[PDB]
Amino acid sequence: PQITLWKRPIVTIKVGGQLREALINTGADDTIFEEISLPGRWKPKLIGGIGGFMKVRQYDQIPIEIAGHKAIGTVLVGPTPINVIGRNMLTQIGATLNF
Amino acid sequence: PQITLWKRPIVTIKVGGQLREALINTGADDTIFEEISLPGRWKPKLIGGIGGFMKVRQYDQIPIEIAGHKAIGTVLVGPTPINVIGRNMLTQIGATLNF
Numbered sequence A, B: 001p002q003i004t005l006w007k008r009p010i011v012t013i014k015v016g017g018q019l020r021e022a023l024i025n026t027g028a029d030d031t032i033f034e035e036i037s038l039p040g041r042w043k044p045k046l047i048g049g050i051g052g053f054m055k056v057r058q059y060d061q062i063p064i065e066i067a068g069h070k071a072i073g074t075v076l077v078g079p080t081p082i083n084v085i086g087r088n089m090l091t092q093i094g095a096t097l098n099f
């Protein structure tokens, strides 16, 4: 698809056998969801650093479907106020910015 | 241009008779630069809200050139750690996300 930016670019995601809404965020290195059960072994990760750190669970090699397109990558699970699709996943779907 | 997302999408901006680097950020509603002198009347604005607020100077109707393309819009000036081009400006240049 082609997504214009007059509204926040929030899209439907398939992840962990569930559906979630998430913000497509070119400003985010990583993809993070609030609390979802995912498969495999996780490890703790501290993220952020600008004013403090948030501890999250890092799951690698998670399949997601982002508005119809399949991606595999790292998904962080933790107490984010806003689910986010970051560049790690956007590269996998071939997302570009165009003007 | 077409910008891939394997690196942070940082681009050269012309603003206030100066050059700055800024992050193209689809996750940001607004455009914010660290401290730059701009023309016109500003007003204070509190931004954020997620953990606290940052007070910034809001300048309206500021021309910028974002990798070659002219945009006019609101520019916030304040103590951001990272200069950001947000959706307010991205819509003016016709920036889209495509996959």
Ligand SMILES: CC(C)CN(C[C@@H](O)[C@H](Cc1ccccc1)NC(=O)O[C@H]1CO[C@H]2OCC[C@H]21)S(=O)(=O)c1ccc(N)cc1
Pocket (backbone or CB within 6 Å): A023, A025, A027, A028, A029, A032, A047, A048, A049, A050, A051, A052, A053, A054, A079, A080, A081, A082, A084, B027, B028, B081, B082
């Ligand atoms: C890490 C996520 C929970 C949230 N994100 C913001 C985060 O990257 C901020 C971005 C940031 C940049 C400049 C100034 C303030 C915040 N950086 C940061 O270090 O925040 C710290 C704040 O306390 C800790 O808890 C979260 C991470 C740690 S994000 O995915 O990029 C993001 C960015 C903007 C929006 N609207 C929604 C999500």
Ligand SMILES: CC(C)CN(C[C@@H](O)[C@H](Cc1ccccc1)NC(=O)O[C@H]1CO[C@H]2OCC[C@H]21)S(=O)(=O)c1ccc(N)cc1
Pocket (backbone or CB within 6 Å): A027, A028, A081, A082, B023, B025, B027, B028, B029, B032, B047, B048, B049, B050, B051, B052, B053, B054, B079, B080, B081, B082, B084
């Ligand atoms: C407002 C700017 C200074 C910074 N931005 C982050 C900001 O939107 C966070 C985004 C955010 C989202 C979820 C969790 C934490 C932070 N939201 C927020 O309310 O932050 C508050 C923190 O203290 C105050 O100072 C800054 C604004 C106030 S941002 O332009 O979207 C931005 C986002 C990510 C990066 N890497 C760089 C910039």
